[PDB]
Design a protein around this ligand. Structure first.
Ligand SMILES: Nc1nc2c(ncn2[C@@H]2O[C@H](COP(=O)(O)OP(=O)(O)OP(=O)(O)O)[C@@H](O)[C@H]2O)c(=O)[nH]1
Ligand SMILES: Nc1nc2c(ncn2[C@@H]2O[C@H](COP(=O)(O)OP(=O)(O)OP(=O)(O)O)[C@@H](O)[C@H]2O)c(=O)[nH]1
Lengths: 440, 453, 441
């Protein structure tokens, strides 16, 4: 229960993985040479961390265990030109000459299984290299149908191969307002159905919400994908800080699996991070724990184009990176309970998980970050997720009503039956979430 | 009638409290951390008695008669590295099973039953090494599912392995349970075995612990190490009656004789004055309290270590131990003042019990303001409310059967119906226990024998 | 015999600090609370038990509790007397600084946090066995102070009906705040009529005048007024703090001074004193005490009807001069035809552990009287209250709790206060006449 196998699928997934590995190297101050970096860090090198994500070899060189799968040679050449490839292993990275389709049609085809076998034996060899296993980490975007389909295939194969450790899948949700590709909602719904089939824990993060955050909080004129990747890296690091570094109240991945699943079928938590602001606001004054706890519930920090006030509260977690007083956060959560911002339920409301980690947050040079000694990452369970689901489902319904492109999908690798199944399953999940939330 | 007691450290919290207790005992008996006694072996004259708690392998080294058992080897390795040569490496149980796969009492009992042979072999080896024995002391740490499962398995083994020994247990309860469902399930499943097999049980609610740690200490932030240090000092004070044998109570069996009126009523409530052996113990010479004020503080709800919730509390057996230079006239005055303020049941004319112990000649002597300390243990049905919290959680969550996919693995039952039936049986058991307590709170309990003769 | 000091409001805190400093300087206790006397001789003639609890460290903690809605003055007193007072005997209501100078908010805070004060006074009583009553020090003008005083008076009368309660009330001077402070003053007066056992009155204007006369700087400070209050309290409590043969408790003093519970308001006087030669004998001291230019209250009367007087003389006195001054006082002061012409003189010993006060070897004297000047002060206060009430309806805008839920009950309570103080002044002016005891004569 110490090793976590992380996989980067698709172009956005590979970029997110590059950003997360770069941030992990920056937190521990890791350069391409290393040997840990160097072999006197304590605890920026062995032991943990890095032993959860970085495999340790005989020479002491930490190897970030990541499987960069992609069928576009441009992204593969880009990730191979950097020092990350020197940090990785050539056999761990998979190369693809021609892109599957636009975008999910061939992403789940037999061409997907031909690479599934190779990556499966590679994962088996990697697990033979290391000792123990905690969970499977996934990083792919739902906008890219190829990446989402390959990630769903990896998830299904890992569930059918081991099925012992819970599977964590970080899904990047597109902007519900604008859709760049016409096949984007179809692939999103199909990937959500595949996760419902073979995922024990998911993650919903919107790109438009991150853009609005960095425009309003960080105050940048031109948001780029690198800033979104760095913010996702900060999010993942805030989640796994308790596993990378030790704290006063360490939490395990099984604690996350228990907290985020209070019902037979509940595996859709939202992520929030606070405080996120410009550097001038941090240079002017410093905030308190109450302000950070109040900003954690704001619609901007929810990383989703939906308002959490209309949602219903369920079991939530809060991990505190840095020096954090227990009485302070207890008073803060009591004040939040007294305010009653989000409507509670009859089962969960006394479920505020509080984890503490000694590792303080790190501000990346690319994306601005509020330099604060205490950061809070909150994994919430609200019913506005169902509202965003219903919005994207009405969009998908109008599309599938016209959809202008049925013959390509029914001829290449799919059919109308699979689309109808995915639509019905998504609508069933939405109404089940609504009924289990509003049952209080 | 005094015998040796073997310590049973279970779980992370249990191991921490055990390490703190052994460090406190070493500081008291001048043993130290290195294991070798700091006092020279020439001055053999010792007023205390480390034999019931320390194995005398050599004349200058006292190995504690304790066994640690945990699934997380990190805390065990840390304790072993901090106490070089103090603990016995053969009494450390990890089973090489890795980290705990969740916080479920089912997984705890599974990991206990799988390696039950190893822990029983270690217990048999310790029994063969020792010559006299009286009973075990188990640290449940019921807040953790794996620790509670391991403690329940240890109890279910010891009850039918050694029936001639008295079993005492220490269950640490949290202040505000984070995962209410899982923590209530674990506490109820451990309370089932406590009712079934455990002979004596002492509860420790973390609410009063955090309150005292915020009051008597200067730092606002509370750390788990000096939080468990409080329970360490409590166990030290309650085992003082055997370490430094007094003239009234000299055996754990004789103490539990008056501490336990019946095996059904085997849950106590502790209370202690502002400590003097903890980290921040400098703010004790500004109170200037006597034995009467010490007794008042012991009877005050602000010094108890569990959730008081004193709404006309019914007392059954109140006992106190005072360590230091105590005055008999002051004890008599305190008894006269307390017999008119403590509620006593009309069916039993038994009053509170007072015992006077001896202070260690090597401990740092405190000024005349706080040179004398006291501990109190009272049989109150106020722990029934702390239990009713978890019972209400169970009643409000069991309507749907949440978290059923976690307690189904590990245990001998993999289906949902069997786990549901086991949880319902444990809930019925704790309900019958609370009914017995609320019946003993009345006068009809003693009339149950008068109505039929 | 033990008396617990109750310091209400910032005025109460100041007068308590000054009184405790004076008592420490007298009994050789100092600021640190430790006994400044050597441990070789334990024979003492004073009595520090009813005022100071001696711990095992031989430290004398003052038996005083501070009840105030302003924690700033309490923190300042604690900083000035670090190691003297007990932090457990401090009560700030845990509500922050004070807000509103009306009696309503004070009484509401008292009724809300009465449990803490009740527990504190119960612990202070159970700490010892021999108890006689409490001692309250507050100003009737301060709204929060008067509210807290009324709340504690109600608690004392409905909890301990056997402990005699004495209080010291300082009436405000002729200023602007009397348009609203008069409400609190008359409410405290009604509470005193209802439940109090003894009260010592003070007039702020007369106190300021006397302090400006005895001092060189006309800018009299509130700290100087509190020092004068501490001096007069020490002079009136010297008989209890140094009991030798006659006086050993306030019970006999109040028995010989207060004739009936309906007449339980006393006017003090003290002369001469400093705050360095001797020029006033005992006869001079007594004539100065009789003269209105030495009383702590505004006389405003050509010949007040003295009912009961009692004086304590400090210093080496001669019986011949004592008799001469007594005869002169009997010839000058007129007594009613129904009450006796009782004049009591108590020779109070000096503290050998007290540093020598300026003007050494100068005999001094205190006098507590019951005359028709307190009734003139009460009549002035009630007339001002009646004027402001019948002319301006502004008191119904600053109320808390039940007094804010409806303003009719407030007006009814104020009318009842006016009625009871009117009955009080009528009873006083009737006792002034010889036809008061005509029911039995
Ligand atoms: N107050 C306090 N509680 C502790 C301490 N150590 C553990 N706990 C309890 O343990 C819970 C967290 O779970 P873990 O400590 O991992 O216990 P576990 O899951 O059974 O794991 P193991 O103890 O290793 O078997 C918390 O809710 C605490 O109540 C401690 O040192 N002090
Ligand atoms: N002589 C004297 N009187 C004081 C002193 N301090 C306060 N007072 C009294 O306080 C009154 C003024 O009201 P405040 O000072 O606000 O008293 P309060 O209304 O009870 O408000 P708080 O003191 O904050 O509780 C005056 O009429 C004085 O009688 C002092 O130091 N000396």
């Amino acid at each position: 229960m110490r090793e976590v196998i992380s996989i980067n699928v698709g172009q956005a997934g590979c970029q997110i993985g590059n950003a997360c590995w770069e941030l992990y190297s920056l937190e521990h101050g890791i350069k391409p040479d290393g040997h840990l970096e160097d072999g006197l860090s304590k605890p920026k090198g062995g032991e943990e961390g890095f032993s959860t994500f970085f495999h340790e070899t005989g020479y002491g060189k930490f190897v970030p265990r990541a499987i960069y799968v992609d069928l576009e040679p441009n992204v593969i050449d880009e990730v191979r030109n950097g020092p990350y490839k020197d940090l990785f292993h050539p056999e761990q990275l998979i190369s693809g000459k021609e892109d599957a389709a636009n975008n999910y049609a061939r992403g789940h085809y037999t061409v997907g299984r031909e690479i599934l076998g190779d990556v499966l034996d590679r994962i088996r060899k990697l697990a033979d290299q290391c000792d123990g296993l905690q969970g499977f980490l996934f990083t792919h975007s739902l906008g890219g149908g190829t990446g989402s389909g390959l990630g769903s295939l990896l998830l299904e194969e890992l569930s059918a191969e081991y099925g012992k450790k819970s599977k964590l899948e970080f899904a990047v949700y597109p902007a519900p307002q604008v859709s760049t590709s016409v096949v984007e909602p179809y692939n999103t719904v199909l990937t959500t159905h595949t996760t419902l089939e073979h995922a024990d824990c998911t993650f919903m993060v919107d790109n438009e919400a991150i853009y609005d955050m960095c425009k309003r909080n960080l105050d940048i004129p031109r948001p780029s994908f690198a800033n979104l990747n760095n913010l996702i890296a900060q999010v993942v690091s805030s989640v796994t800080a308790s596993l990378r570094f030790d704290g006063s109240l360490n939490v395990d991945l099984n604690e996350f699996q228990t907290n985020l699943v209070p019902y037979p079928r509940i595996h859709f938590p939202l992520v929030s991070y606070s405080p996120v602001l410009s550097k001038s606001k941090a240079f002017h004054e410093s905030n308190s724990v109450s302000e950070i706890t109040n900003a954690c519930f704001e619609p901007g920090n929810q990383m989703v184009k939906c308002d959490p006030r209309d949602g219903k509260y369920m079991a939530t977690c809060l991990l505190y990176r840095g020096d954090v007083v227990t009485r302070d956060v207890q008073r803060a959560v009591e004040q939040v309970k007294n305010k009653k911002t989000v409507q509670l339920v009859d089962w969960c409301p006394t479920g505020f998980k509080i984890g503490i980690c000694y590792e303080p947050p790190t501000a990346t040079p690319n994306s601005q970050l509020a330099t604060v000694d205490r950061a809070v990452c909150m994994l919430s369970n609200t019913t506005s997720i169902a509202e965003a689901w219903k919005r994207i489902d009405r969009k998908f319904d109008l599309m599938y009503a016209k959809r202008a492109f049925v013959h390509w999908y029914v001829g290449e690798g799919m059919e109308e039956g699979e689309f109808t199944e995915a639509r019905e399953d998504l609508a069933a999940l939405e109404r089940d979430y609504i009924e289990v939330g509003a049952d209080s | 009638m005094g015998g040796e007691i073997i310590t049973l450290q279970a779980g992370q919290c249990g191991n921490h409290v055990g390490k703190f207790l052994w460090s406190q005992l070493a500081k008291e008996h001048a043993i130290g951390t290195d294991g070798l006694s700091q006092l020279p072996d020439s001055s053999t004259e010792r007023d205390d008695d480390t034999k019931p708690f320390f194995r005398e392998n050599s004349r200058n080294k006292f190995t504690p008669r304790a066994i640690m058992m945990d699934s997380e080897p990190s805390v065990i390795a840390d304790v072993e590295n901090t106490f070089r040569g103090f603990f016995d490496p053969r009494n450390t149980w990890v089973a090489s099973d890795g980290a705990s796969a969740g916080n479920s009492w089912a997984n705890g009992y599974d990991i206990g039953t799988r390696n039950q042979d190893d822990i029983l072999n270690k217990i048999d080896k310790e029994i063969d090494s020792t010559d006299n024995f009286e009973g075990f002391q188990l640290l449940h740490s019921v807040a953790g599912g794996t620790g509670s499962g391991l403690g329940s398995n240890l109890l279910e083994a010891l009850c039918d392995r050694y029936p001639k020994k008295i079993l005492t247990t220490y269950s640490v309860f949290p202040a505000r349970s984070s995962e209410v469902v899982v923590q209530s399930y674990n506490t109820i499943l451990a309370l089932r075995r406590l009712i079934e097999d455990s002979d004596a049980t002492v509860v420790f609610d973390n609410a009063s612990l955090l309150n005292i740690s915020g009051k008597v200490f200067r730092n606002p932030n509370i750390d788990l190490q000096h939080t468990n240090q409080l329970i360490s000092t409590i166990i030290s004070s309650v085992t003082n009656s055997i370490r430094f044998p007094s003239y009234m109570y000299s055996s754990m069996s004789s103490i539990y004789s008056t501490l336990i009126p019946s095996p059904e009523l085997h849950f106590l409530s502790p209370s202690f004055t502002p400590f003097t052996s903890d980290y921040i113990h400098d703010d004790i010479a500004h109170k200037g309290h006597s034995s009467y004020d010490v007794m008042l503080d012991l009877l005050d709800p602000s010094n108890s270590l569990v959730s008081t919730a004193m709404n006309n509390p019914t007392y059954f057996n109140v006992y106190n131990t005072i360590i230091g230079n105590v005055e008999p006239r002051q004890i008599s005055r305190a008894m006269t003042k307390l017999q008119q303020r403590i509620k006593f049941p009309s069916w039993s004319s038994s009053a509170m019990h007072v015992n006077i112990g001896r202070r260690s000649p090597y401990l740092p002597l405190q000024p005349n303001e706080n040179e004398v300390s006291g501990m109190m243990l009272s049989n109150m049905s106020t722990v029934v409310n702390v239990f009713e919290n978890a019972c209400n959680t169970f009643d409000k969550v069991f309507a749907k059967g949440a978290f059923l996919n976690n307690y189904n693995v590990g245990d001998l039952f993999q289906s949902m119906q069997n786990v549901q039936d086991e949880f319902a049986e444990s809930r019925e058991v704790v309900q019958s226990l609370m009914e017995d307590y609320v019946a003993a709170e009345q006068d009809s309990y003693l009339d149950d024998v008068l109505v039929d003769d």
